[PDB]
């Protein structure tokens, strides 16, 4: 269970192949469920499963 900029949740993080644009901070699925997030420290994209 994690906390990115206050976005709290539970899941298993993984290296993401999603190419976030620079202004995008987190991702959302077909059903608006958050399924990716940019780590504010290292700025890498992490898939939330």
């Amino acid at each position, epitope marked *: 269970n994690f906390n990115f900029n206050g976005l709290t949740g539970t899941g298993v993080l993984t290296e993401s192949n999603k*190419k*976030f644009l*620079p*202004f995008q901070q987190f991702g959302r699925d077909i059903a608006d469920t958050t399924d990716a997030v*940019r780590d504010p*420290q*290292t*700025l*890498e*994209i992490l898939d939330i499963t």
Partner: antibody
Framework: QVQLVESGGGVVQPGRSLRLSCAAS????????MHWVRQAPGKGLEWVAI????????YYADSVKGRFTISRDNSKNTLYLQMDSLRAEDTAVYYC?????????????????????????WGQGTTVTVSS | SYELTQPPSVSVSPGQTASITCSGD??????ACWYQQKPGQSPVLVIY???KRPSGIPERFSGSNSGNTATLTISGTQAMDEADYYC???????????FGTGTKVTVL
């Protein structure tokens, strides 16, 4: 002060691997892309690789494509270059160079979408030699 | 394939104009930059965006680009110019940042 300092040089047998580390201070490292540029003895400079500000996009020169692997840690303000299968021609002094124009401002979100070409700040450079 | 060609060296006297050239098939369709590398020291940016000058560099440095040729030009040679100059074709979209063969300016 805006400075870059490299580390991790040495002598390596052919076919081995080595990882350089370039530390950055005096500026927001996470805002700028980073380059690796090497200069073999008595030869001109050659661009090694580039990495985006967040590490999503990377490009390599044809001489090192497939072998090398550039990476960065924006939280530690450090840049890395994993070399694999070092050859004789890889002997060169490796510099890490900062872009004159930052790709994206983390602090304010400023995303210019139009950037200058220069690389203003270069590091001191650490020698790497391949021999037996 | 791509590669930039520059003359091996150029000889110039103090006070005389020095013309330093770099050429390539797509060099003028791209922003080209120049770096001044003293012997044994790291390069120092001198010209970028084909005519722009970094802050603190003497105004006597200048450059231009057109067609297949990019050219760094010195209004007047001085004792600090003994170095090696390298051209770089720049393009963020293509990921094209290759350097040139360089050229040794010789203050005779």
């Amino acid at each position: 002060q805006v400075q870059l300092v490299e580390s991790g040089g040495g002598v390596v047998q052919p076919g081995r691997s080595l990882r350089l580390s370039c530390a950055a201070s005096g500026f927001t490292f996470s805002n700028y892309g980073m380059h690796w540029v090497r200069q073999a003895p008595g030869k001109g400079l050659e661009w090694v690789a580039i990495i985006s500000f967040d590490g999503s996009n990377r490009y390599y020169a044809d001489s090192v494509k497939g072998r090398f692997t550039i990476s960065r840690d924006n939280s530690k303000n450090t840049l890395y270059l994993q070399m694999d299968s070092l050859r004789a021609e890889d002997t060169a002094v490796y510099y890490c160079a900062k872009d004159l124009s930052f790709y994206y401002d983390i602090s304010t979100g400023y995303y210019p979408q139009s950037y200058n070409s220069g690389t203003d700040v270069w590091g001191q450079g650490t020698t790497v030699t391949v021999s037996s | 394939s791509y590669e930039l060609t520059q003359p091996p060296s150029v000889s110039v006297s103090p006070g005389q104009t020095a013309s330093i050239t770099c050429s390539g098939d797509k060099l003028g369709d791209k922003y080209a930059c120049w770096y001044q590398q003293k012997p044994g020291q790291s390069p120092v940016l001198v010209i970028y965006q084909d005519n722009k000058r970094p802050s603190g560099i003497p105004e006597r440095f200048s450059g231009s680009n057109s067609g297949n040729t990019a050219t760094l030009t010195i209004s007047g040679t001085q004792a600090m110019d003994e170095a090696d100059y390298y051209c770089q074709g720049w393009d963020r979209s293509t990921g094209y940042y290759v350097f040139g063969t360089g050229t040794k300016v010789t203050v005779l």
